[PDB]
């Protein structure tokens, strides 16, 4: 299966968050680093099943503005349409 880890305390911008996802989810080099792009990768790229472990979520919200929650929402929406995703918020 695929495992992805986000260390929330190291996230200091919405760009850091997209770069971490790029690496952790083995995203294409063209990855657009936006919500449209992430959904595209979750639904037509990424390997399943996927375990997303999001540590220090609250700290990652501080320097991402609305970014962290918008991102989490896309993964929840992916899991709502059948993608096999386990999200661990610690």
């Amino acid at each position: 299966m695929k495992k992805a880890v986000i260390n929330g305390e190291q996230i200091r911008s919405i760009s850091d968050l997209h770069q971490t996802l790029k690496k952790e989810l083995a995203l294409p080099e063209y990855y657009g680093e936006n919500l449209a792009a992430l959904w595209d990768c979750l639904t037509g790229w990424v390997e399943y099943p996927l375990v997303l472990e999001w540590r220090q979520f609250e700290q990652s919200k501080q320097l991402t503005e609305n970014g962290a929650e918008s991102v989490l929402q896309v993964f929840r929406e992916a899991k709502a349409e059948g993608c096999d995703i386990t999200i661990i918020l610690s």
């Binding site: 294409p28 063209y30 990855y31 657009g32 680093e33 936006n34 919500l35 449209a36 792009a37 959904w39 595209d40 639904t43 037509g44 790229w45 990424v46 390997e47 399943y48 918008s70 896309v74 929406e77």
Partner: protein, 110 residues
Amino acid sequence: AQVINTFDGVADYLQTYHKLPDNYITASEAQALGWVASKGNLADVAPGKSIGGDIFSNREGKLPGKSGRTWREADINYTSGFRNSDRILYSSDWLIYKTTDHYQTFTKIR
């Protein structure tokens, strides 16, 4: 019919017939034929098909939103292997946009 998978041909087809060309299948249909995105096996299981027709939520508001308008997208310039970064985007009232940089930027084409 021959594959139509270019920005211009798919845009004119959409505008003219109000439907995608028949070489497009949605991601759920693809999945029913055994597409496994991380394997990049689309052309093996569905020769000459491209992913297209799925809902495009427009979450960041980069395309013009209006009550009642829904958006859909489709892959452009795909032949086989892993998917690329080109997409055409088309609305329920037939406005057409494209992106060649994986949704960073969009250009209005119809």
